[PDB]
Design a protein around this ligand. Structure first.
Ligand SMILES: CC(C)(C)OC(=O)N[C@@H](Cc1ccccc1)[C@H](O)CN[C@@H](Cc1ccccc1)C(=O)N[C@@H](CCC(=O)O)C(=O)N[C@@H](Cc1ccccc1)C(N)=O
Ligand SMILES: [Cl-]
Ligand code: NA
Lengths: 99, 99
């Protein structure tokens, strides 16, 4: 519904049959998850943030359920310290910022 | 206002007499600005993100105008490729995520 930001906006996701926690990140163009097993054909990618760059595997058309909200989109998998849900999926769940 | 996320949520800020653009980032605990002179006392800090860690200068009690909303808070200055407004200031403008 509506989430304040006094604490990290952590949500439960279900992806690839697995339950995880992930951060809702409006600062992220892309969705980036810690190393995991995704079936299908991926492509090598490199992405950047504060600190520098990492290599990821780009998985397209992956089902993920965010707060029980089904979305299908690209997920990058690689050596990120946390699971980040980026704008590519935040748009599909109709997410906005408000103030 | 309400801001969708089809595009990066970039906003105009006024800080230290200067106008800049910055990213509203719910994934950021802290507010991190590219190099800039700020007056007064500051403390050394390290912060991390997707690719690694950086050294920043921490400034407290700094006035920032974000979309015409004045807030006073801590601002980190350092080698970030982008100006990021983090939750420490997003809360002060009463910002929420909604879906
Ligand atoms: C993830 C991709 C798609 C590659 O995009 C970004 O990294 N976008 C960044 C925007 C940007 C663009 C250009 C240049 C620089 C930055 C966001 O800030 C990403 N948001 C989160 C994603 C994240 C969260 C947690 C872990 C890893 C990555 C972030 O870095 N947040 C930082 C922002 C810096 C800050 O707030 O101080 C954070 O909260 N860092 C914490 C937590 C932390 C600790 C240790 C390692 C990593 C993170 C910290 N206290 O250092
Ligand atoms: Cl996508
Ligand atoms: Na993407």
């Amino acid at each position: 519904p509506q989430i304040t930001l006094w604490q990290r906006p952590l949500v439960t996701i279900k992806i690839g049959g697995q339950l995880k926690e992930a951060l809702l990140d409006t600062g992220a163009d892309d969705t980036v998850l810690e190393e995991m097993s995704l079936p299908g054909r991926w492509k090598p990618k490199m992405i950047g943030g504060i600190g520098g760059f990492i290599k990821v595997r780009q998985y397209d058309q992956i089902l993920i359920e965010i707060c029980g909200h089904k979305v299908i989109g690209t997920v990058l998998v690689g050596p990120t310290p946390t699971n980040v849900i980026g704008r590519n999926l935040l748009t599909q769940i109709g997410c906005t910022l408000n103030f």
